[PDB]
Design a protein around this motif. Sequence first.
Motif, mmCIF file in Angstrom:
data_model
loop_
_atom_site.group_PDB
_atom_site.id
_atom_site.type_symbol
_atom_site.label_atom_id
_atom_site.label_comp_id
_atom_site.label_asym_id
_atom_site.label_seq_id
_atom_site.Cartn_x
_atom_site.Cartn_y
_atom_site.Cartn_z
ATOM 1 N N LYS B 39 -6.675 51.274 3.482
ATOM 2 C CA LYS B 39 -7.531 51.046 2.325
ATOM 3 C C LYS B 39 -8.941 51.546 2.614
ATOM 4 O O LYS B 39 -9.402 51.496 3.758
ATOM 5 C CB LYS B 39 -7.556 49.559 1.956
ATOM 6 C CG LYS B 39 -8.249 49.248 0.638
ATOM 7 C CD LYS B 39 -8.238 47.757 0.347
ATOM 8 C CE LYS B 39 -6.817 47.223 0.256
ATOM 9 N NZ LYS B 39 -6.038 47.900 -0.818
ATOM 10 N N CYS B 40 -9.631 52.030 1.584
ATOM 11 C CA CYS B 40 -10.996 52.509 1.758
ATOM 12 C C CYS B 40 -11.944 51.331 1.949
ATOM 13 O O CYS B 40 -12.465 50.767 0.982
ATOM 14 C CB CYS B 40 -11.410 53.335 0.538
ATOM 15 S SG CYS B 40 -12.988 54.215 0.649
ATOM 16 N N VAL B 41 -12.165 50.955 3.211
ATOM 17 C CA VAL B 41 -12.966 49.780 3.538
ATOM 18 C C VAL B 41 -13.885 50.076 4.716
ATOM 19 O O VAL B 41 -13.720 51.085 5.410
ATOM 20 C CB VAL B 41 -12.075 48.560 3.846
ATOM 21 C CG1 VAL B 41 -11.339 48.095 2.597
ATOM 22 C CG2 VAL B 41 -11.095 48.890 4.962
ATOM 23 N N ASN B 42 -14.858 49.196 4.945
ATOM 24 C CA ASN B 42 -15.768 49.321 6.081
ATOM 25 C C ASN B 42 -15.208 48.541 7.263
ATOM 26 O O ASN B 42 -14.712 47.421 7.100
ATOM 27 C CB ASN B 42 -17.155 48.809 5.704
ATOM 28 C CG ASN B 42 -17.760 49.569 4.544
ATOM 29 O OD1 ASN B 42 -18.010 49.003 3.478
ATOM 30 N ND2 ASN B 42 -18.007 50.857 4.744
ATOM 31 N N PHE B 43 -15.281 49.126 8.455
ATOM 32 C CA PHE B 43 -14.785 48.496 9.669
ATOM 33 C C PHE B 43 -15.909 48.328 10.685
ATOM 34 O O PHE B 43 -16.892 49.072 10.699
ATOM 35 C CB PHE B 43 -13.633 49.308 10.274
ATOM 36 C CG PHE B 43 -13.934 50.771 10.433
ATOM 37 C CD1 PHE B 43 -14.605 51.240 11.549
ATOM 38 C CD2 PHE B 43 -13.535 51.680 9.468
ATOM 39 C CE1 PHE B 43 -14.880 52.586 11.695
ATOM 40 C CE2 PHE B 43 -13.804 53.026 9.611
ATOM 41 C CZ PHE B 43 -14.479 53.480 10.724
ATOM 42 N N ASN B 44 -15.744 47.318 11.547
ATOM 43 C CA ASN B 44 -16.652 47.030 12.650
ATOM 44 C C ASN B 44 -15.786 46.668 13.860
ATOM 45 O O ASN B 44 -15.419 45.516 14.092
ATOM 46 C CB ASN B 44 -17.635 45.908 12.299
ATOM 47 C CG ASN B 44 -18.814 45.831 13.258
ATOM 48 O OD1 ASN B 44 -19.969 45.878 12.837
ATOM 49 N ND2 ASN B 44 -18.527 45.702 14.548
ATOM 50 N N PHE B 45 -15.445 47.681 14.659
ATOM 51 C CA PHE B 45 -14.603 47.487 15.840
ATOM 52 C C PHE B 45 -15.466 47.564 17.101
ATOM 53 O O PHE B 45 -15.688 48.626 17.687
ATOM 54 C CB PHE B 45 -13.476 48.510 15.869
ATOM 55 C CG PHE B 45 -12.352 48.200 14.922
ATOM 56 C CD1 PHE B 45 -11.318 47.364 15.308
ATOM 57 C CD2 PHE B 45 -12.326 48.745 13.652
ATOM 58 C CE1 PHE B 45 -10.280 47.076 14.441
ATOM 59 C CE2 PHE B 45 -11.292 48.463 12.782
ATOM 60 C CZ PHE B 45 -10.268 47.627 13.177
ATOM 61 N N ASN B 46 -15.953 46.392 17.512
ATOM 62 C CA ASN B 46 -16.740 46.236 18.731
ATOM 63 C C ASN B 46 -17.972 47.132 18.730
ATOM 64 O O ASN B 46 -18.302 47.744 19.752
ATOM 65 C CB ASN B 46 -15.878 46.518 19.964
ATOM 66 C CG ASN B 46 -14.710 45.560 20.090
ATOM 67 O OD1 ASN B 46 -14.307 44.924 19.117
ATOM 68 N ND2 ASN B 46 -14.160 45.452 21.295
ATOM 69 N N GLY B 47 -18.655 47.219 17.593
ATOM 70 C CA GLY B 47 -19.848 48.035 17.493
ATOM 71 C C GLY B 47 -19.634 49.314 16.715
ATOM 72 O O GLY B 47 -20.548 49.804 16.046
ATOM 73 N N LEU B 48 -18.424 49.867 16.795
ATOM 74 C CA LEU B 48 -18.099 51.100 16.089
ATOM 75 C C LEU B 48 -18.035 50.842 14.590
ATOM 76 O O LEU B 48 -17.062 50.265 14.091
ATOM 77 C CB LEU B 48 -16.774 51.675 16.603
ATOM 78 C CG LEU B 48 -16.495 53.169 16.412
ATOM 79 C CD1 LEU B 48 -16.036 53.489 14.996
ATOM 80 C CD2 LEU B 48 -17.724 53.993 16.777
ATOM 81 N N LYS B 49 -19.065 51.267 13.864
ATOM 82 C CA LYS B 49 -19.150 51.066 12.426
ATOM 83 C C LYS B 49 -18.973 52.386 11.685
ATOM 84 O O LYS B 49 -19.073 53.467 12.269
ATOM 85 C CB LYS B 49 -20.489 50.433 12.041
ATOM 86 C CG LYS B 49 -20.592 48.957 12.372
ATOM 87 C CD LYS B 49 -21.979 48.418 12.072
ATOM 88 C CE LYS B 49 -23.010 49.021 13.007
ATOM 89 N NZ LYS B 49 -22.667 48.753 14.430
#
Lengths: 50, 49, 49
Positions: B39-49
């Motif tokens: 899905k077209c969403v914003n992610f925050n994986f351990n700092g990786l935005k």
Amino acid sequence: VYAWNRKRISNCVADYSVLYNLAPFFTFKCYGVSPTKLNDLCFTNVYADS
Amino acid sequence: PTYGVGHQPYRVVVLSFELLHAPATVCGPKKSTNLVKNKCVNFNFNGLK
Amino acid sequence: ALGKLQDVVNHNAQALNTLVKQLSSKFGAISSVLNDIFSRLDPPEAEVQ
């Protein structure tokens, strides 16, 4: 200064909110990072010297 | 005990970080929204935005 | 034999590859990822980097 200590800090929840509230005449100067943005960045290893 | 303000005893503590691709350990405090599939969403994986 | 028809293709397959390799070369900043300059620096040193 001639013989300092290096604490290995790891596996913790780094809440830097208790840091800036220190004794008078304190400075939170940061060389590379900003002191205000240190709450949403996953740090790998932090080393503290005294 | 009577030295000038400029020459009074100070104490300094320095913190050195390792903000790179290695597995993070001292991540600050900030929630953990559930995950979501494609899905077209914003992610925050351990700092990786 | 058909080399002058491949040179025009290789030249375009090289300028397009030499251009995607400059998105990972910092020019005086802390990193080449734009998502990391705003997650470690407040907004007045960022505008500088």
